[PDB]
């Protein structure tokens, strides 16, 4: 039994209704759940039996169901609903989940307020180096970081971590945090992060001992 | 011909948990003693535990008693050693042998149990607040968990009652080996001088808990 | 309240072995159907197993199909997976969940099973005999066999009929992460023009097996 | 129960006997064993009962008891019988074994047949040249292998693996690969493999070409 689920991700802004389908490729009953995921976190149950609601759940959340064809209905897109959406057929003894929806949120383009760091002064006297960089409540996700080290372009000696999508503002936050040892940061005096979004660029800079 | 057979054997992090099988073949489990016995790379061997024939009486050494446990399956010909609470000196290569005449005869081949990459804990660094660095009222505090496996680590601030505006990164796996991730919060520019910030980092794997009070930095 | 605890999970090579267990909290597992989810790195989730409450009917996936094994202990109120043959698609995070209402109410944490860097056979090169490179009499000729994972390898020369003089050294790991290991053989200098030798390597992780016929090098 | 092995390791030639003893910490009955152990091997049981020699042991192995002094006795040391030798208690139901004693079978000191084999030309297409240098039947173990390019000492590009012991003829064998990428292979002409042993030193090489 092949649960064909559509679509495969989604982008839907605050308000807007959601209709993700669930086509069953054999009629096996009604015995079709839904389930909530968010990244690292086990699947949450949403609706059971395919039209009623498990204990707890916001009402936004619906199930239907037209002979082979199972719905799930967000009314009310609340930016806490981000998450990876599946459908599940327990008939036949021979659960059967779909291949899943990831729900993102849509939101006005906001450009992200950058922050630097110069390393601190303890992690200095072992050796090592962290200058981070910090894009602070940003959109949509896409950005370019740059590191530059005396206008000399770094390369291949910093990572960068992103946040899940913020539950309230929808928004992104990156950093990127360049690591060097205590000589090579001692050798220089300007740290710059310059951070591309579409048409704009922001570099934020210090100068060692200012 | 009598033959032993041993699997169930790999890597495990320190604690976790396996099940080594000594799958026997040309006499039956249930009529003899079994036993099980351990020798770390480039050490000698060591006895972790024994079984009974039919009272299933096991018995074990300080070593592993309480971590490890004995078993074994006559409808299979196949005894057992469930391992749990994993550690450094854990890492041997594992036989099972029969024993007989007051001695172990027969002998498997072995399995490698091998514990994994010694728990780190994390190192924090204050992502130091600033003026020139801040917009004129949002202000950027954070802490920098560096150097540490393995995971989770658990970031709150001010004991869990700040929580607007912070945003705790995922871990990046530096090339070390080690994990290291940062934790960050706007607040108030003015909020900066009055309002005392902690993050408080928590490694249960390493039963460490840090709290380092974020401070304005030195000219 | 109703917990559901997994651990067990760890890293294997291809085939191994290894058992999981859903320690059940709040409830009696015996009287749930108890479900093996499990989901890979990026990829959606995966039934693997189910388990019926009393009559302890075991229910699986062709996917693991005689090579998982799902079991339950109502005396610890524990679920079990014994995994067995394991391959690179069973890298994934493992979960157990409790049925009800024709779905799966509660959920674990989920445990993380990784397969082994991938098998790979040896690649075998001649170590060509000479003349000047070589005594009066005395004369050496191998076999080189480098870029093979995982152990072992067995290297056999002319069928096994050629065993006075023969050397096979221990593998050493290269910093590829790959074996590699050479076997030696020292002939008479006069038999270098009509005795032929056939170096028999044997890689049965890869069920793969090499026959070089080393021979004079060339000008 | 502490049973403790003596001595930790001997070096005794062919003919010669031996006398390993375990001295029990406690009087605990004479359910003393004794095994042999090579490399990669499983124990190999010699004998139980701390004198009854288990079936299939060459008569030149015997065990004895003085009180808490268990010994086991090799009469005429057999160039196969170098291995790690075992005393082990199996009295109070608490198994418990010796330490260990590693026997090593000396032998007239022997200088190797070095052998230098350039690279396959199979390999060389592959990109990676791997140059060996073999030191074939010498005693003892120790010795120093060092490569040189065109004179040039290398230095961080070696791998080197010895054998055990010969059951025959108690000498080693070792092989030193050097590997390098194909352009640095083609780029150099003389390759020389230098074994240092004592007071004598020996240099084989090959011009690449000839």
């Known amino acids: 039994i092949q649960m064909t689920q559509s679509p495969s991700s989604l982008s839907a802004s605050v308000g807007d209704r959601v209709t993700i389908t669930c086509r069953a490729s054999q009629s096996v009953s009604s015995a079709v759940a839904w389930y909530q995921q968010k990244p690292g976190k086990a699947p949450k149950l949403?609706?059971?039996?395919?039209?009623?609601?498990?204990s707890g759940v916001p009402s936004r959340f619906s199930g239907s169901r037209s002979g082979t064809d199972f719905t799930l209905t967000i009314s009310s897109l609340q930016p806490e609903d981000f998450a990876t959406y599946y459908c599940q057929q327990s008939s036949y003894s021979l659960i059967t989940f779909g291949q899943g929806t990831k729900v993102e949120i849509k939101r006005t383009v906001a450009a992200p307020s950058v922050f630097i760091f110069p390393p601190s002064d303890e992690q200095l006297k072992s050796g090592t180096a962290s200058v981070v960089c910090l894009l602070n409540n940003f959109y949509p996700r896409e950005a370019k970081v740059s590191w530059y080290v005396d206008n000399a372009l770094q390369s291949g000696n910093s990572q960068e971590s992103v946040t899940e999508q913020d539950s309230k503002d929808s928004t992104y936050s990156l950093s990127s945090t360049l690591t060097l040892s205590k000589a090579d940061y001692e050798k220089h005096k300007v740290y710059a992060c310059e951070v591309t979004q579409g048409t704009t660029s922001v570099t934020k800079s210090f100068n060692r001992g200012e | 011909e009598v033959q032993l057979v041993e699997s169930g054997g790999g890597l495990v992090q320190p604690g976790g948990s396996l099940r080594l099988s000594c799958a026997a073949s040309g006499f039956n489990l249930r009529s003899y003693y079994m036993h099980w016995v351990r020798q770390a790379p480039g050490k000698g061997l060591e006895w972790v535990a024994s079984i009974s024939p039919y009272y299933s009486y096991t018995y074990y050494a300080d070593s592993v008693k309480g971590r490890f446990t004995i078993s074994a399956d006559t409808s299979k010909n196949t005894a057992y050693l469930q391992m749990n609470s994993l550690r450094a000196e854990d890492t041997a290569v594992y036989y099972c042998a029969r024993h007989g005449y007051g001695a172990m005869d027969y002998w498997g081949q072995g399995t490698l149990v091998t514990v994994f990459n010694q728990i780190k804990g994390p190192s924090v660094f204050p992502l130091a607040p600033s003026s020139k660095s801040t917009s004129g009222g949002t202000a950027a505090l954070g802490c920098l968990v560096k150097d540490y496996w393995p995971e989770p680590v658990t970031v709150s601030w001010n004991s869990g009652a700040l929580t607007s505006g912070v945003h705790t990164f995922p871990a990046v796996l530096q090339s070390s080996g080690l994990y290291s991730l940062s934790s960050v919060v706007t607040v108030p520019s003015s909020s900066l001088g009055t309002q005392t910030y902690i993050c408080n980092v928590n490694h249960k794997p390493s039963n460490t808990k840090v709290d380092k009070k974020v401070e304005p930095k030195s000219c | 309240e109703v917990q559901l605890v997994e651990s067990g999970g760890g890293l294997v090579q291809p085939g191994g072995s290894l058992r999981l267990s859903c320690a059940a909290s709040g409830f009696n597992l015996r009287s749930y159907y108890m479900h093996w989810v499990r989901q890979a790195p990026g990829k959606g989730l995966e039934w693997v197993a189910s388990i019926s409450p009393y009559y302890s009917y075991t229910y699986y996936a062709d996917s693991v199909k005689g090579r998982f094994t799902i079991s339950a202990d109502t005396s610890k109120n524990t679920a079990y997976l014994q995994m067995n043959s394991l391959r690179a698609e069973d890298t994934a995070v493992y979960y157990c969940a409790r049925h009800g209402y024709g779905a799966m109410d509660y959920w674990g944490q989920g445990t993380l099973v990784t397969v082994f860097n991938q098998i790979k056979g040896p690649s075998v090169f001649p170590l060509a005999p000479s003349s000047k490179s070589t005594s009066g009499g005395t004369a050496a000729l191998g076999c080189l066999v480098k870029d093979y994972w995982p152990e072992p390898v067995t290297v056999s020369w002319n069928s096994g009929a050629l065993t006075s003089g023969v050397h096979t050294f221990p593998a050493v790991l290269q910093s590829s992460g790959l074996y590699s290991l050479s076997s030696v053989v020292t002939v008479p200098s006069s038999s270098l023009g009509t005795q032929t030798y056939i170096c028999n390597v044997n890689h049965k992780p890869s069920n793969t097996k090499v026959d070089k016929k080393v021979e004079p090098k060339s000008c | 129960i502490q049973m403790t092995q003596s001595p930790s390791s001997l070096s005794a030639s062919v003919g010669d006997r031996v006398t390993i003893t375990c001295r029990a910490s406690q009087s605990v009955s004479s359910a003393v064993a004794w095994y042999q152990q090579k490399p990669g091997k499983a124990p190999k049981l010699l004998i139980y009962?701390?004198?009854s020699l288990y079936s299939g042991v060459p008569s030149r192995f015997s065990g004895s008891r003085s009180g808490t002094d268990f010994t086991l006795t090799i009469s005429s040391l057999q160039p196969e019988d170098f291995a790690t030798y075992y005393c082990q208690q199996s009295s109070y139901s608490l198994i418990t074994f010796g330490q260990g004693t590693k026997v090593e079978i000396k032998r007239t000191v022997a200088a190797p047949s070095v052998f230098i084999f350039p690279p396959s030309d199979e390999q060389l297409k592959s990109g990676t040249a791997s140059v060996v240098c073999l030191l074939n039947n010498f005693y003892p173990r120790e010795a120093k292998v060092s490569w040189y390019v065109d004179n040039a000492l290398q230095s961080g590009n070696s791998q080197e693996s010895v054998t055990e012991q010969d059951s025959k003829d108690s000498t080693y064998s070792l092989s030193s690969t050097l590997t390098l990428s194909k352009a640095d292979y083609e780029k150099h002409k003389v390759y020389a493999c230098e074994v240092t042993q004592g007071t004598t030193s020996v240099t084989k090489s090959f011009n690449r070409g000839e």
């Open positions: 009962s701390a004198s």
